Design an enzyme around this catalytic site. Structure first.
Site, mmCIF file in Angstrom:
data_model
loop_
_atom_site.group_PDB
_atom_site.id
_atom_site.type_symbol
_atom_site.label_atom_id
_atom_site.label_comp_id
_atom_site.label_asym_id
_atom_site.label_seq_id
_atom_site.Cartn_x
_atom_site.Cartn_y
_atom_site.Cartn_z
ATOM 1 N N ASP A 83 0.759 -1.217 0.000
ATOM 2 C CA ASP A 83 0.000 0.000 0.000
ATOM 3 C C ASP A 83 0.804 1.289 0.000
ATOM 4 O O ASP A 83 1.207 1.798 1.045
ATOM 5 C CB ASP A 83 -0.937 -0.100 1.217
ATOM 6 C CG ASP A 83 -2.059 0.914 1.287
ATOM 7 O OD1 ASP A 83 -2.027 1.965 0.661
ATOM 8 O OD2 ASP A 83 -3.006 0.630 1.986
ATOM 9 N N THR A 84 0.899 1.961 -1.155
ATOM 10 C CA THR A 84 1.623 3.220 -1.215
ATOM 11 C C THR A 84 0.897 4.357 -0.514
ATOM 12 O O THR A 84 1.534 5.360 -0.262
ATOM 13 C CB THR A 84 1.907 3.643 -2.687
ATOM 14 O OG1 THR A 84 0.693 3.742 -3.404
ATOM 15 C CG2 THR A 84 2.757 2.606 -3.390
ATOM 16 N N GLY A 85 -0.402 4.304 -0.227
ATOM 17 C CA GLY A 85 -1.054 5.413 0.455
ATOM 18 C C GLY A 85 -0.919 5.369 1.981
ATOM 19 O O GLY A 85 -1.463 6.197 2.706
HETATM 20 C C1 LIG Z 1 -1.666 7.728 7.277
HETATM 21 O O1 LIG Z 1 -1.337 6.318 7.122
HETATM 22 C C2 LIG Z 1 -2.190 5.208 7.063
HETATM 23 C C3 LIG Z 1 -3.494 5.427 6.620
HETATM 24 C C4 LIG Z 1 -4.323 4.336 6.397
HETATM 25 C C5 LIG Z 1 -5.744 4.549 5.903
HETATM 26 N N1 LIG Z 1 -6.123 4.246 4.436
HETATM 27 C C6 LIG Z 1 -7.394 3.779 4.370
HETATM 28 O O2 LIG Z 1 -8.296 3.953 5.226
HETATM 29 N N2 LIG Z 1 -7.708 3.083 3.250
HETATM 30 C C7 LIG Z 1 -9.185 2.815 2.934
HETATM 31 C C8 LIG Z 1 -9.651 2.827 1.504
HETATM 32 C C9 LIG Z 1 -9.598 4.009 0.750
HETATM 33 C C10 LIG Z 1 -10.044 3.995 -0.570
HETATM 34 C C11 LIG Z 1 -10.532 2.804 -1.114
HETATM 35 O O3 LIG Z 1 -10.910 3.077 -2.376
HETATM 36 C C12 LIG Z 1 -10.579 1.643 -0.353
HETATM 37 O O4 LIG Z 1 -10.975 0.474 -0.996
HETATM 38 C C13 LIG Z 1 -10.202 -0.735 -0.763
HETATM 39 C C14 LIG Z 1 -10.148 1.653 0.954
HETATM 40 N N3 LIG Z 1 -6.814 2.161 2.566
HETATM 41 C C15 LIG Z 1 -6.255 1.021 3.416
HETATM 42 C C16 LIG Z 1 -7.363 -0.015 3.488
HETATM 43 C C17 LIG Z 1 -7.636 -0.816 2.365
HETATM 44 C C18 LIG Z 1 -8.689 -1.725 2.410
HETATM 45 C C19 LIG Z 1 -9.450 -1.836 3.576
HETATM 46 C C20 LIG Z 1 -9.165 -1.034 4.685
HETATM 47 C C21 LIG Z 1 -8.122 -0.124 4.656
HETATM 48 C C22 LIG Z 1 -5.841 2.756 1.538
HETATM 49 C C23 LIG Z 1 -4.758 3.335 2.425
HETATM 50 O O5 LIG Z 1 -3.653 3.878 1.763
HETATM 51 C C24 LIG Z 1 -5.196 4.498 3.435
HETATM 52 C C25 LIG Z 1 -5.748 5.764 2.728
HETATM 53 C C26 LIG Z 1 -5.632 7.038 3.582
HETATM 54 C C27 LIG Z 1 -4.398 7.696 3.728
HETATM 55 C C28 LIG Z 1 -4.320 8.861 4.502
HETATM 56 C C29 LIG Z 1 -5.460 9.367 5.128
HETATM 57 C C30 LIG Z 1 -6.678 8.708 4.977
HETATM 58 C C31 LIG Z 1 -6.776 7.547 4.209
HETATM 59 C C32 LIG Z 1 -3.860 3.033 6.612
HETATM 60 C C33 LIG Z 1 -2.569 2.814 7.071
HETATM 61 C C34 LIG Z 1 -1.746 3.911 7.300
HETATM 62 O O6 LIG Z 1 -0.497 3.697 7.739
#
Ligand SMILES: COc1cc(CN2C(=O)N(Cc3ccc(O)c(OC)c3)N(Cc3ccccc3)C[C@@H](O)[C@H]2Cc2ccccc2)ccc1O
Lengths: 99, 99
Positions: free
Chosen positions: B25-27
């Site tokens: 996961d790059t995000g």
């Molecule tokens: C700041 O660091 C972190 C942040 C996250 C949270 N985070 C999420 O809540 N989402 C949820 C998600 C987003 C979009 C989608 O389209 C989706 O579908 C699978 C799921 N996913 C992780 C995930 C996948 C599937 C099921 C549950 C979670 C993508 C992540 O990069 C990130 C996106 C994000 C980044 C920054 C701020 C808010 C959201 C996780 C771990 C970390 O270390």
């Protein structure tokens, strides 16, 4: 280009005549943007992430230019903290993960 | 290897003697894994995600083998729905995003 991951992978996007920065997110199935002025119809949808679920408005066939590359796809708009470009648009700009 | 993004980027990892699959996961800034048996001390921490915040246990200097590449870093364990390998370990195995 090639992006290393020592900092967040942020790119400029142009959507609906507006300029925004968004995260290239391989963990995200969908593209979800914070609340914005976007034209037309939309359907309600719910997505789940870390911490719970959010209600988003889903727009189809929306043009986005991500780092200069045009793509058209579904965009979810709603209460996300960060603009996310997920895998539905990353395949369209030919983005890969390499190690 | 080169991973295209038409399917979720899942990889096999070995952590604390156990085998799991995790999302590249790059995000994600951090690595967060579902509740698991893990040896040691930990600090409570909270991370924020799309639907809100979760409390996790932070474990430092944990060895993780990710697709046969060893890395040592901080791992957060808690109520995530998916095992997430974030950028703190992705830079260690030399992963880049390319388009
Ligand atoms: C700041 O660091 C972190 C942040 C996250 C949270 N985070 C999420 O809540 N989402 C949820 C998600 C987003 C979009 C989608 O389209 C989706 O579908 C699978 C799921 N996913 C992780 C995930 C996948 C599937 C099921 C549950 C979670 C993508 C992540 O990069 C990130 C996106 C994000 C980044 C920054 C701020 C808010 C959201 C996780 C771990 C970390 O270390």
């Amino acid at each position: 280009p090639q992006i290393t991951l020592w900092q967040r992978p942020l790119v400029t996007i142009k959507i609906g005549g507006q300029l925004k920065e968004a995260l290239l997110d391989t963990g995200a199935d969908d593209t979800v943007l914070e609340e914005m002025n976007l034209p037309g119809r939309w359907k309600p949808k719910m997505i789940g992430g870390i911490g719970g679920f959010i209600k988003v408005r889903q727009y189809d066939q929306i043009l986005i230019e991500i780092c200069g590359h045009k793509a058209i796809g579904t965009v979810l708009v709603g209460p996300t903290p960060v603009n996310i470009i997920g895998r539905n648009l990353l395949t369209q700009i030919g983005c890969t993960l390499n190690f």
